[PDB]
Amino acid sequence: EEGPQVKIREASKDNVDFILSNVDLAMANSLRRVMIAEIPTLAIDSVEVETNTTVLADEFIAHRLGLIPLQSMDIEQLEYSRDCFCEDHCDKCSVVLTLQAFGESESTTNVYSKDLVIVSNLMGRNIGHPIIQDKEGNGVLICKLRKGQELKLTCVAKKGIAKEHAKWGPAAAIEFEYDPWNKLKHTDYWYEQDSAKEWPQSKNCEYEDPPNEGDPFDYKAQADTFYMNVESVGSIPVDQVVVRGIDTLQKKVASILLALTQMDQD
Partner 1 sequence: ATLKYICAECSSKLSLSRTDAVRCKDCGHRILLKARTKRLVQFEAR
Partner 2 sequence: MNAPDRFELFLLGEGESKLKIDPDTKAPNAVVITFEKEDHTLGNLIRAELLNDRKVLFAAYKVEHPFFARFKLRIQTTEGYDPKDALKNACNSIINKLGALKTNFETEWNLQTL
Partner 3 sequence: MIVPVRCFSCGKVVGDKWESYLNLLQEDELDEGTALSRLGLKRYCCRRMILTHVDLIEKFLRYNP
What residues line the site for Zn ion (CB under 5 A)?
Answer: 84, 86, 90, 92-93
Pairing type for strands 226-232 and 109-112 reads unpaired
Does residue 50 interact with partner 1 by CB under 8 A? Answer: yes
| Contact of 126 with 74, CB cutoff 8 Å | yes
Does residue 58 interact with partner 1 by CB under 8 A? Answer: yes
- Window 111-170: residues binding partner 1 (CB under 8 A): 148, 155, 165, 167
Residue 25 binding result from partner 2, Zn ion, partner 1, none, given CB thresholds of 5 to 8 Å by partner type:
partner 2
Does residue 46 interact with partner 1 by CB under 8 A? Answer: yes
Q: Helices (DSSP H) in the chain: which residue ranges?
A: 25-37, 58-66, 195-198, 238-262
Judged by CB under 8 A, which stretch of 26-34, 132-140, 146-154, 188-196 contacts partner 2?
26-34
Residue 247: partners with Cβ closer than 8 Å, 6 or more residues away: none
Least distance (Å) between residue 49 CB and partner 1: 6
d(CA 111, CA 127): 21
Helix (H, G, I), strand (E, B) or coil at 54: coil
For residue 178, CA distances in Å to 22, 61, 162, 172, 211 come to 12, 41, 26, 20, 14
Residue 161 binding result from partner 3, partner 2, Zn ion, none, given CB thresholds of 5 to 8 Å by partner type:
partner 2
Neighbours of 196 (CB within 10 A): 9
Q: Using CB under 8 A, which of 107, 212, 255, 265 touches partner 2?
A: 255
Does residue 221 interact with partner 2 by CB under 8 A? Answer: no
Edge-first strand listing for the sheet containing 171-178: 5-11, 15-21, 226-232, 171-178
Is 143 annotated among the ligand-binding residues?
A: no
Binding mask 135-154 for partner 3 (x = CB under 8 A): xx-xxxxxxxxx-x------
| Contact of 23 with 246, CB cutoff 8 Å | no
Does residue 27 interact with partner 2 by CB under 8 A? Answer: yes
Judged by CB under 8 A, which stretch of 32-40, 43-51, 127-135, 138-146 contacts partner 2?
32-40
- Rounded to the nearest 5 degrees, what angle is found at the Cα of 22, between the Cα atoms of 205 and 250? 125
Does residue 220 interact with partner 2 by CB under 8 A? Answer: no
| Contact of 102 with 150, CB cutoff 8 Å | yes
Interface residues toward partner 1, by CB under 8 A: 43-51, 58-59, 62-63, 65-66, 148, 155, 165, 167
Q: Would you list which residues are annotated within the binding site for Zn(2+)?
A: 84, 86, 90, 93
Interface residues toward partner 3, by CB under 8 A: 53, 55-56, 64, 67-69, 108, 110, 113, 131-136, 138-146, 148, 166, 169, 171-173, 231, 233-234
